[PDB]
């Protein structure tokens, strides 16, 4: 029993992190086969970031402007190119610890683990969700750019996020591993802000199921509601609307607990309207929306990774 | 910026996990050099655990009663012995991925990362604290015994916990890596319960500093209090008493924020007496006590590991 904010084991990713220096700027890079992926703003100086012109900036660089260190070993850069907001550095050595991997662009609501890194060295791992406004609520200090987010499916590491910047509200924005930003952000020093965030409803329900699986039942009631009736209440409190795909996704959890999704929705409606009254659920005094239905199944039924 | 429940990167530990089978029982073991460490109850059958007699049970076993798998490779067991509640299985091959390591018995209030495992395979990593009643609030399913807790100091992995059992309140109990239980528990199927828990005061203060470092200042006030005055209020709400060592430990955080420990204590006194009134701190509606002062420094100043 028990329920924790649980991250994926990070070993397979730790062996792919390297340090990348261009000029005075050092950040992290991801070394898979003979390519090192990193944020393209490593080729910038302070005079550039007002409105950098990355095509020009990259044409003025040569392979020897790039210092790549894997631990103590220097890697020789034999080619470079730009894809959207990422730089790809061809190196002369293929990473012998390259795991089976793929690049995935995730959807808001999905979760992933972040391996926070500084100077090529792993500092810590934690779990977070892509918010509906395409930010994540991370923990990042100077030098953290190029840190990656990932999932593990059976044996395949799915990379989905590379860190680029922090917004004035203290949240974080980055790209997929092909360099496309999540959300409307750009890699320039210009004023940007996240849109308003909403609560991920399907995830709150998944977490209520986890609570039931673990013996926190005080919020259940005998009522039912309809999708239409529930969604009307949801938008009033800034919750994402619930869809039929969401209902179907929650199926396994409904099955294991014997509570129908629409039953659970009437409990959630209740909690929105009267609050929790100093009671807690799974140790929290707030409704938690950073566990997906698959996260709950994984942690309450025990799937491992190879 | 940002603040997350952050675990240590798990790569160095993942390479030491193995599967251990004795008879019908399979659990996890820790393979360092040529020794595999695992809970001694792997030598039990259901008929035994009422009141097992482990000396007798172990004398009736031979080296070939133990099946150790590292991935697909079987390891040959060439010796066995018992130390307190752990079994040590000498194997014929030394683990080539053995990190620099040590065994540490931690104190209540300290935190560590748990690498939850099933059948020798890492399932996920999360952070938790030794509670004052010598339990941890973990997440463990059948087959999880032998999963280990650890810290990383510079390059050395410090193992401090091996998982054995779950108590009726849904919390968890285990041993250090020399087999001594934390707390008054024993490895038998007999009625056991944890003592009453208390809140780890020095950790709540460390987390209030983290909040200030991250811009949550609404709970500060201009008052000060005394250790004696604060501790009197603390015991009323089931908080650990604060000591002068605690004050000294909080020194770096006091220094970086300019708020004196005794200032911060008057804010905490305030929060105990009037609550939070629907406000949050660092995204939480409860006072959080599972971050040590060192955890806050590590995450708000950026230390890495090699
Ligand atoms: C990566 N190393 C770092 C990430 C930052 C550092 C602290 N926390 C983080 O997440 N990247 C940067 O230095 C970027 N700058 C910031 O994150 C920056 N915020 C900021 O200027 N925001 C707006 C106005 C929205 C652009 C602070 C340091 C937090 C104040 C970038 C990354 C690239 C694009 C852009 C210009 C530079 C190159 C610096 C932001
Ligand atoms: C290890 N594989 C497993 C850990 C458990 C399984 C589910 N969650 C966990 O943490 N160990 C056990 O099966 C132990 N049993 C329990 O944890 C058990 N609780 C229990 O009986 N508690 C008291 C009454 C306090 C002993 C449940 C499965 C949760 C109901 C042990 C481990 C060894 C000592 C003792 C007898 C057996 C050998 C089983 C408990």
Swiss-Prot record, chains A, B:
Coiled coil: none annotated. The active site is at 41 (for 3cl-pro activity), 145 (nucleophile). Residues 1-306 form the Peptidase C30 domain. It catalyses: TSAVLQ-|-SGFRK-NH2 and SGVTFQ-|-GKFKK the two peptides corresponding to the two self-cleavage sites of the SARS 3C-like proteinase are the two most reactive peptide substrates. The enzyme exhibits a strong preference for substrates containing Gln at P1 position and Leu at P2 position. Residues 1-306 are cytoplasmic. Inhibited by pyridone-containing alpha-ketoamides compounds 13a and 13b. In turn, alpha-ketoamide 13b (tert-butyl (1-((S)-1-(((S)-4-(benzylamino)-3,4-dioxo-1-((S)-2-oxopyrrolidin-3-yl)butan-2-yl)amino)-3-cyclopropyl-1-oxopropan-2-yl)-2-oxo-1,2-dihydropyridin-3-yl)carbamate) inhibits SARS-CoV-2 replication in human lung cells. Inhibited ex vivo by michael acceptor inhibitor N3. Inhibited ex vivo by compound 11a and 11b. There is a cross-link at residues 5, 90 (Glycyl lysine isopeptide (Lys-Gly) (interchain with G-Cter in ubiquitin)). Changing residue 189 to A: Does not affect ability to cleave and inactivate human TRMT1. It is found in: Host cytoplasm; Host Golgi apparatus; Host nucleus. 3CL-PRO exists as monomer and homodimer. Only the homodimer shows catalytic activity. Interacts with host FBXO22; this interaction promotes the proteasomal degradation of nsp5. Cleaves the C-terminus of replicase polyprotein at 11 sites. Recognizes substrates containing the core sequence [ILMVF]-Q-|-[SGACN]. Cleaves and inactivates human TRMT1, preventing tRNA guanine(26)-dimethylation of tRNAs. May cleave human NLRP1 in lung epithelial cells, thereby activating the NLRP1 inflammasome pathway. May cleave human GSDMD, triggering alternative GSDME-mediated epithelial cell death upon activation of the NLRP1 inflammasome, which may enhance the release interleukins 1B, 6, 16 and 18. Also able to bind an ADP-ribose-1''-phosphate (ADRP). This is 3C-like proteinase nsp5. It comes from Severe acute respiratory syndrome coronavirus 2 (2019-nCoV).
